[PDB]
Design a protein around this ligand. Structure first.
Ligand SMILES: [Mg+2]
Ligand SMILES: [Mg+2]
Ligand SMILES: [Mg+2]
Ligand SMILES: [Mg+2]
Ligand SMILES: [Mg+2]
Ligand SMILES: [Mg+2]
Ligand SMILES: [Mg+2]
Ligand SMILES: [Mg+2]
Ligand SMILES: [Mg+2]
Ligand SMILES: [Mg+2]
Ligand SMILES: [Mg+2]
Ligand SMILES: [Mg+2]
Ligand SMILES: [Mg+2]
Ligand SMILES: [Mg+2]
Ligand SMILES: [Mg+2]
Ligand SMILES: [Mg+2]
Ligand SMILES: [Mg+2]
Ligand SMILES: [Mg+2]
Ligand SMILES: [Mg+2]
Ligand SMILES: [Mg+2]
Ligand SMILES: [Mg+2]
Ligand SMILES: [Mg+2]
Ligand SMILES: [Mg+2]
Ligand SMILES: [Mg+2]
Ligand SMILES: [Mg+2]
Ligand SMILES: [Mg+2]
Ligand SMILES: [Mg+2]
Ligand SMILES: [Mg+2]
Ligand SMILES: [Mg+2]
Ligand SMILES: [Mg+2]
Ligand SMILES: [Mg+2]
Ligand SMILES: [Mg+2]
Ligand SMILES: [Mg+2]
Ligand SMILES: [Mg+2]
Ligand SMILES: [Mg+2]
Ligand SMILES: [Mg+2]
Ligand SMILES: [Mg+2]
Ligand SMILES: [Mg+2]
Ligand SMILES: [Mg+2]
Ligand SMILES: [Mg+2]
Ligand SMILES: [Mg+2]
Ligand SMILES: [Mg+2]
Ligand SMILES: [Mg+2]
Ligand SMILES: [Mg+2]
Ligand SMILES: [Mg+2]
Ligand SMILES: [Mg+2]
Ligand SMILES: [Mg+2]
Ligand SMILES: [Mg+2]
Ligand SMILES: [Mg+2]
Ligand SMILES: [Mg+2]
Ligand SMILES: [Mg+2]
Ligand SMILES: [Mg+2]
Ligand SMILES: [Mg+2]
Ligand SMILES: [Mg+2]
Ligand SMILES: [Mg+2]
Ligand SMILES: [Mg+2]
Ligand SMILES: [Mg+2]
Ligand SMILES: [Mg+2]
Ligand SMILES: [Mg+2]
Ligand SMILES: [Mg+2]
Ligand SMILES: [Mg+2]
Ligand SMILES: [Mg+2]
Ligand SMILES: [Mg+2]
Ligand SMILES: [Mg+2]
Ligand SMILES: [Mg+2]
Ligand SMILES: [Mg+2]
Ligand SMILES: [Mg+2]
Ligand SMILES: [Mg+2]
Ligand SMILES: [Mg+2]
Ligand SMILES: [Mg+2]
Ligand SMILES: [Mg+2]
Ligand SMILES: [Mg+2]
Ligand SMILES: [Mg+2]
Ligand SMILES: [Mg+2]
Ligand SMILES: [Mg+2]
Ligand SMILES: [Mg+2]
Ligand SMILES: [Mg+2]
Ligand SMILES: [Mg+2]
Ligand SMILES: [Mg+2]
Ligand SMILES: [Mg+2]
Ligand SMILES: [Mg+2]
Ligand SMILES: [Mg+2]
Ligand SMILES: [Mg+2]
Ligand SMILES: [Mg+2]
Ligand SMILES: [Mg+2]
Ligand SMILES: [Mg+2]
Ligand SMILES: [Mg+2]
Ligand SMILES: [Mg+2]
Ligand SMILES: [Mg+2]
Ligand SMILES: [Mg+2]
Ligand SMILES: [Mg+2]
Ligand SMILES: [Mg+2]
Ligand SMILES: [Mg+2]
Ligand SMILES: [Mg+2]
Ligand SMILES: [Mg+2]
Ligand SMILES: [Mg+2]
Ligand SMILES: [Mg+2]
Ligand SMILES: [Mg+2]
Ligand SMILES: [Mg+2]
Ligand SMILES: [Mg+2]
Ligand SMILES: [Mg+2]
Ligand SMILES: [Mg+2]
Ligand SMILES: [Mg+2]
Ligand SMILES: [Mg+2]
Ligand SMILES: [Mg+2]
Ligand SMILES: [Mg+2]
Ligand SMILES: [Mg+2]
Ligand SMILES: [Mg+2]
Ligand SMILES: [Mg+2]
Ligand SMILES: [Mg+2]
Ligand SMILES: [Mg+2]
Ligand SMILES: [Mg+2]
Ligand SMILES: [Mg+2]
Ligand SMILES: [Mg+2]
Ligand SMILES: [Mg+2]
Ligand SMILES: [Mg+2]
Ligand SMILES: [Mg+2]
Ligand SMILES: [Mg+2]
Ligand SMILES: [Mg+2]
Ligand SMILES: [Mg+2]
Ligand SMILES: [Mg+2]
Ligand SMILES: [Mg+2]
Ligand SMILES: [Mg+2]
Ligand SMILES: [Mg+2]
Ligand SMILES: [Mg+2]
Ligand SMILES: [Mg+2]
Ligand SMILES: [Mg+2]
Ligand SMILES: [Mg+2]
Ligand SMILES: [Mg+2]
Ligand SMILES: [Mg+2]
Ligand SMILES: [Mg+2]
Ligand SMILES: [Mg+2]
Ligand SMILES: [Mg+2]
Ligand SMILES: [Mg+2]
Ligand SMILES: [Mg+2]
Ligand SMILES: [Mg+2]
Ligand SMILES: [Mg+2]
Ligand SMILES: [Mg+2]
Ligand SMILES: [Mg+2]
Ligand SMILES: [Mg+2]
Ligand SMILES: [Mg+2]
Lengths: 63, 156, 124, 96
RNA sequence: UGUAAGUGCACAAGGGAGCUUGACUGCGAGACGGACAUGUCGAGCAGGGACGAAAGUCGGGACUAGUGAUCCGGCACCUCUG
RNA sequence: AACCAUAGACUCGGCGAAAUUGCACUACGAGUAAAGAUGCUCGUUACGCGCGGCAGGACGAAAAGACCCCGGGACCUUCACU
RNA sequence: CCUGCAUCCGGUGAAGCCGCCGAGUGAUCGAGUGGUGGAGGGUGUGGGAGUGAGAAUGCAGGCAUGAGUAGCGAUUAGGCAAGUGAGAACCUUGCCCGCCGAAAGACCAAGGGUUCCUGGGCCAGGCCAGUCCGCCCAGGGUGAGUCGGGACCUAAGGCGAGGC
RNA sequence: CGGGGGAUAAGCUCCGUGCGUCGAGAGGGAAACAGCCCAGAUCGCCGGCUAAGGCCCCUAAGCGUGUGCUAAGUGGAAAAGG
RNA sequence: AUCAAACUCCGUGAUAGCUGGUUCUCCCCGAAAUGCAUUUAGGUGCAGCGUCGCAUGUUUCUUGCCGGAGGUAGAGCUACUG
RNA sequence: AGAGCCCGGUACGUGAAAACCCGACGUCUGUCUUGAUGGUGUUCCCGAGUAGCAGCGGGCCCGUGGAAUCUGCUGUGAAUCUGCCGGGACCACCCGGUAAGCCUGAAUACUUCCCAGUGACCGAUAGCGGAUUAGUACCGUGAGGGAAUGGUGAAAAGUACCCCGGGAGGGGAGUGAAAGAGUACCUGAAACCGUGCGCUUACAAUCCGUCAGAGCCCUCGACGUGUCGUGGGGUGAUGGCGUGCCUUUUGAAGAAUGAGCCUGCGAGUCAGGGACAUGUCGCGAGGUUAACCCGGGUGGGGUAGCCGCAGCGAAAGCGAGUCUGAAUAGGGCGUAUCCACACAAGAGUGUGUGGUGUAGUGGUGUGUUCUGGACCCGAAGCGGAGUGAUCUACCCAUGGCCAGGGUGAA
RNA sequence: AGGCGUCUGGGGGGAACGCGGGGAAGUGAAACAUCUCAGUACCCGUAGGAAGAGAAAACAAAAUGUGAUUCCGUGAGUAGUG
């Protein structure tokens, strides 16, 4: 019975060339009126996930 | 437990009986019941690379040649007349060790049919040579045509 | 294959009973209850093997004190005199000699008394 | 522990798949130079024989390395650097 | 000293007066504490501005509270796809 | 409150029962501790083995407490939802 | 324990069991010795385990105490002479006494199937012993034109050709 | 040890302590007594030296030495006060 | 012989954040009962605390000296509020 | 008592009255040759309540969402070759096809039965519930549930005969190798109950042992009557020490639970080219085969597939670079790593040239993990299908039953 | 319509395998209505030794491609869906 890969994880994460895990930051979709300009600018872009939770994520994506 | 017969009911009440409190009549703890982890049908087939097997066979034959345990016979015994006595005499003259392997081409039957009965002899077609068979016997006797066919097929 | 626990357990149980032979009550007839008191016996033997040192030292000291008091000198002063004279013989030797050679014991006591200092109360 | 975890409380990736992709396979001019000392004509068949790219896939060459041997190149797509390198190496390259 | 307390402000951040919307865009070298994501500051570059002759300051409010993830959907624009 | 008879309880003859059961040549006064000790400290008493009687203790036997709470069922009621 | 391979032991006694004597730092070991037995085993090196018990108010089988203790299943109650036989208060004969008698008696239908008689014995059973038995063995035994049913008729109800 | 809740009560509860121990720790010491004092168990020895505490007998070691207090079994249960 | 929803075969080895049990040996090393969060408090994820290996290996710790900012203990009031 | 040459038979040969089925060889049945071949313009045909459309439901990944296709029901309802339907709404241009009628073997799925074979599967609490009276006895009026019971020996030669006795039972003498084989019959352990022998105890406060320890008794040596010895054994008068086992507990010898004893039975395994990690063997810029064929056989073929070989970007794409962006202007990702050489600040490092140059992939051991109940066992309750009103409730048709004595309406 | 006479066929059983319908609840989401369990158990009507399906109103996309149906391995746990 071939292994099952979690739908959400493979849909909300990505693998880079060398094997690091990347994600996107939250608190951006809506209601950013009071947020100053530098807020979204810093809150934009990608970032490498913290190494603390790396082990769990790797298991999910692989299955 | 789930496949043996019977044992479909709770044997008695739960509280107030006072004896051992049980759930089913054919539980693994009862005598005559099922087994926790019993052997189940399975298959022992194994994968082995062709390169590995060929290298093993080549090494075995190379060692046999190094130790000088290979001999070539044009033919076992005069054809169209099986005779075990002549074959036994010829094998004794050739070698005196207990066990020996003889390989003969498929299209010939008289040699095998005459050499079948010897206790320490095993017959094998040249196309089915295998490491276990070569190792088991101490010496190997090759027919000329069989040897030629094997060498040609392998070198091709 | 199917294997039957025939010999493995019976070997250990035979040796346990053989070692346990000589007890009282069920403890010498029932295997299950036996080994508990086997453990207790081994622990007690371990403990008293060490306690033997103190017990024998106690007996030797008692005997030496009795002999010295009979010979009219205290045990503490006798040991002090022996230490001053620098004779290293052991309490067991003194005890055996006293039970065997009262003359030798008296000679040793006299030597110790001679070797004793002038005043035991001096601040030195 | 009841709390919605990371895979539950983070946004999604940004975009779609575009199943109409048309990938090629990369070939390095430096590797070709290293593998073909004498030079000459090159093509998909001999490239596959040398085992540089998958046989059924589409072929495209890249010019990261340095070239010093005349060669005739036949492929499906080219990059500017590879084109200039081939031209300067005293050779010619054509596209189907 | 708008809104509680503390920390501060008598040189002002207290009050008065003239002009004007930087309560911009594109960026960010490095740090702050945090199990996780949330939170805070920042020199300096370019465009085009404001005030001021100049030097110079301005990416909201003397400071610390006035708020809310995910999914789904609406609206304007786009050199994406179809 | 007293007395008398019947069937047991008592000895003799025959057949022959159940619950429980960690162990035993299983005292007590004052203490000591998971706070109430036959089984630990100090001290006092006490020939070995039986039979007929009395039931304070051995937290005596009986049913994984009904009373309380936690978790899960069942039935019931309605202007709780569908 | 079962297995591939190479070896050795065995009706001149192989496997378990019960001792003696010893031995390793452990789970233990003895190609060292004694009794019982009669038919397969050990060492070396590989592969595979249903491969190791004391407790779950566990389960199958056997056996401990209470115990030679309680009871021996009512509201009537036995006694004597003789007989049988090895054994008799409990079996057979005879004579006294008591009890029941709208039943502790005489029968029908329903209900069981050989408990009925003759002949045999008393390792199983009868709450004790049994010559006895509703114990068993072997044989025998059930006679309707008129008694109860069917061949005579019907009810509450069931089946149901067609049909809905 | 320094604190809050409490009646400046609990063998109560809640904090902080490059704090000890028990929990996961035998021996000796205080009669017994996990959380106190000394002291960290590789094994054997019929050997020596010591910490804590003791030296009338139970019970090994001093009815030790020199200078002073006690009349209450104070020694071997506690305060205002007399 | 059981009824606030009878009995038998099956779905069926119904399912438990809950109670119980889990066996032959030796050598080395050796824990926590804390913080954050939680339809969460006797459950569970992460952090700290252990072991094996890999890589840089004294960067760890104690003492002496040197440069550093605090607002407790204390103390004080014609130095501010009482 | 372990047999190639003792017997049954195995290699090999033969072999059938009758019958079976297959295959091949023979009268008979029937279309066509009154008919076939290549061209042309005109008039008719190519499967009816169907296709399509509208509403309500199904199953295709599509869980009404824009909803393509097939299909169930209800209304409406079309055309015949420049006709019609299909290429995930739809229009236009292209491309394919001709539904509304019917048959069609071969590649595939399975064993109640019969024939022939195999077991690194079980050996009487295992093995199918069933090695014997077997779905029997037995329990339940019903559906139904569901038991335990092998080994004498070469043959019975199953102990003539005599004795004690009623028998049961036993002793001699014989059978036989054994009778320590006597139908209760192989090998015979522990709980359990014994008889004989040696030691010890009736003034004693013991989780019942250990360390010392006189006497008595048995034994091995040297020496003599009993006395020592690098001696062993059993008993123990008497002194010191000494709070059971497992669970769960911060905390228990407990008066927190489990254990009557004994022999058996009962527990981290398996399946998948799965995943991560870690050793082991070949190959090396390749590795690697499925399904399937030929071999009584594990062997030989089989390029269909999967991973590294270049990455960035949601994309049109580009490429040792790439996206953001007006910006060579900084940033995010990548060019194995390093050394050396030059340029910058020494804002920690970056920017340009040259080298050695990169290691992954198949089998397999082991720890964990994924999907199956996955360490073991454990309820109140739900649904489907079936069984009961012989007691108990009510009713229906049909009989029987009530001993004696008082009270006195119309 | 119905009624007579005469011929031809049918009423049940069978371990598994097929075709077309009907068709449940335990359980996971730490609950649960959507889902999943599952078109599973069971039932119904059905024949055979096999059955069903079957001769394009089929795919693909500018290749001058395949050419009835069925069954396996890949195509991939990907394009999607919740
Ligand atoms: Mg996906
Ligand atoms: Mg947006
Ligand atoms: Mg904005
Ligand atoms: Mg942006
Ligand atoms: Mg971690
Ligand atoms: Mg009981
Ligand atoms: Mg069982
Ligand atoms: Mg069974
Ligand atoms: Mg079984
Ligand atoms: Mg192969
Ligand atoms: Mg004794
Ligand atoms: Mg000492
Ligand atoms: Mg101002
Ligand atoms: Mg704003
Ligand atoms: Mg930063
Ligand atoms: Mg400017
Ligand atoms: Mg600025
Ligand atoms: Mg501001
Ligand atoms: Mg201002
Ligand atoms: Mg949501
Ligand atoms: Mg009175
Ligand atoms: Mg009287
Ligand atoms: Mg009486
Ligand atoms: Mg009485
Ligand atoms: Mg009486
Ligand atoms: Mg009796
Ligand atoms: Mg009990
Ligand atoms: Mg008390
Ligand atoms: Mg008390
Ligand atoms: Mg109490
Ligand atoms: Mg006590
Ligand atoms: Mg008491
Ligand atoms: Mg005691
Ligand atoms: Mg004491
Ligand atoms: Mg007295
Ligand atoms: Mg009571
Ligand atoms: Mg009780
Ligand atoms: Mg209750
Ligand atoms: Mg509740
Ligand atoms: Mg209900
Ligand atoms: Mg064996
Ligand atoms: Mg032999
Ligand atoms: Mg023999
Ligand atoms: Mg013998
Ligand atoms: Mg024998
Ligand atoms: Mg081997
Ligand atoms: Mg092995
Ligand atoms: Mg395995
Ligand atoms: Mg097993
Ligand atoms: Mg046992
Ligand atoms: Mg039992
Ligand atoms: Mg009893
Ligand atoms: Mg009695
Ligand atoms: Mg009585
Ligand atoms: Mg009676
Ligand atoms: Mg009589
Ligand atoms: Mg009467
Ligand atoms: Mg009458
Ligand atoms: Mg009457
Ligand atoms: Mg009747
Ligand atoms: Mg009758
Ligand atoms: Mg009769
Ligand atoms: Mg009779
Ligand atoms: Mg009798
Ligand atoms: Mg009887
Ligand atoms: Mg009879
Ligand atoms: Mg008649
Ligand atoms: Mg009718
Ligand atoms: Mg009809
Ligand atoms: Mg304090
Ligand atoms: Mg306090
Ligand atoms: Mg508390
Ligand atoms: Mg605390
Ligand atoms: Mg400690
Ligand atoms: Mg301690
Ligand atoms: Mg102590
Ligand atoms: Mg030590
Ligand atoms: Mg000293
Ligand atoms: Mg001191
Ligand atoms: Mg003394
Ligand atoms: Mg004194
Ligand atoms: Mg003095
Ligand atoms: Mg006092
Ligand atoms: Mg006082
Ligand atoms: Mg006073
Ligand atoms: Mg109900
Ligand atoms: Mg019932
Ligand atoms: Mg199921
Ligand atoms: Mg089942
Ligand atoms: Mg169950
Ligand atoms: Mg569970
Ligand atoms: Mg428990
Ligand atoms: Mg350590
Ligand atoms: Mg806290
Ligand atoms: Mg250093
Ligand atoms: Mg200072
Ligand atoms: Mg103060
Ligand atoms: Mg003041
Ligand atoms: Mg044999
Ligand atoms: Mg024959
Ligand atoms: Mg849908
Ligand atoms: Mg749709
Ligand atoms: Mg289209
Ligand atoms: Mg065409
Ligand atoms: Mg058509
Ligand atoms: Mg087929
Ligand atoms: Mg047996
Ligand atoms: Mg019945
Ligand atoms: Mg004989
Ligand atoms: Mg018997
Ligand atoms: Mg026997
Ligand atoms: Mg005495
Ligand atoms: Mg005492
Ligand atoms: Mg003691
Ligand atoms: Mg004591
Ligand atoms: Mg436990
Ligand atoms: Mg505890
Ligand atoms: Mg604990
Ligand atoms: Mg404890
Ligand atoms: Mg007790
Ligand atoms: Mg307890
Ligand atoms: Mg209790
Ligand atoms: Mg408890
Ligand atoms: Mg038991
Ligand atoms: Mg019992
Ligand atoms: Mg895995
Ligand atoms: Mg690996
Ligand atoms: Mg390697
Ligand atoms: Mg990508
Ligand atoms: Mg950059
Ligand atoms: Mg039900
Ligand atoms: Mg009925
Ligand atoms: Mg009238
Ligand atoms: Mg039919
Ligand atoms: Mg849940
Ligand atoms: Mg739930
Ligand atoms: Mg489904
Ligand atoms: Mg057919
Ligand atoms: Mg078809
Ligand atoms: Mg069709
Ligand atoms: Mg696929």
């Amino acid at each position: 019975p071939k292994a099952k890969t979690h739908s959400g994880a493979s849909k909300r994460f990505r693998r880079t060339g060398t094997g690091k895990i990347v994600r996107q930051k939250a608190n951006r979709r809506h209601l950013l009126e009071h947020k100053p300009t530098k807020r979204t600018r810093r809150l934009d872009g990608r970032t490498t996930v913290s190494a603390a939770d790396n082990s769990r994520i790797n298991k999910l994506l692989n299955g | 437990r789930g496949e043996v017969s019977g044992g479909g009911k709770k044997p008695y009440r739960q509280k107030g009986t006072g004896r051992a409190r049980q759930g089913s009549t054919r539980a693994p703890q009862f005598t005559g019941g099922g087994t926790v982890h019993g052997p189940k049908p399975r298959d022992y087939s194994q994968r082995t690379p062709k390169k590995m097997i060929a290298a093993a066979l080549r090494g075995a034959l190379s060692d046999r040649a190094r130790n000088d345990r290979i001999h070539a016979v044009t033919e076992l015994v005069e054809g169209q007349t099986p005779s075990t006595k002549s074959a036994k005499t010829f094998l004794g003259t050739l070698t005196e060790n207990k066990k020996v392997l003889v390989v003969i081409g498929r299209t010939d039957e008289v040699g095998a049919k005459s050499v079948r009965n010897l206790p320490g002899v095993h017959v094998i077609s040249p196309d089915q040579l295998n490491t276990y068979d070569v190792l088991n016997a101490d010496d190997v006797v090759f027919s000329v045509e069989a040897l030629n066919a094997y060498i040609s097929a392998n070198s091709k | 294959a199917r294997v039957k626990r025939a010999l493995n357990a019976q070997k250990k149980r035979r040796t346990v009973l053989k070692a346990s032979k000589g007890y009282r009550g069920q403890r010498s007839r029932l295997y299950r209850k036996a080994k508990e008191q086997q453990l207790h016996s081994l622990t007690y033997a371990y403990r008293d093997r060490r306690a033997r040192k103190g017990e024998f030292r106690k007996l030797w000291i008692s005997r030496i004190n009795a002999a010295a008091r009979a010979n009219d000198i205290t045990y503490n002063r006798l040991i002090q005199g022996l230490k001053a004279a620098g004779v290293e013989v052991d309490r067991k030797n003194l005890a055996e000699l006293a039970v065997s050679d009262p003359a030798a014991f008296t000679a040793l006591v006299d030597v110790a008394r001679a070797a004793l200092p002038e005043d035991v109360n001096a601040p030195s | 522990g009841g709390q919605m975890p990371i895979h539950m409380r983070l946004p999604k990736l940004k975009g779609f798949k575009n199943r109409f992709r048309t990938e090629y396979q990369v070939v390095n001019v430096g590797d070709i130079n290293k593998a073909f000392p004498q030079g000459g004509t090159v093509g998909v068949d001999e490239l596959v024989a040398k085992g540089l790219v998958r046989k059924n896939s589409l072929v495209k060459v890249l010019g990261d390395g340095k070239l010093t041997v005349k060669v005739d190149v036949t492929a499906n797509k080219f990059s500017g650097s590879a084109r200039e390198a081939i031209t300067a190496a005293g050779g010619s390259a054509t596209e189907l």
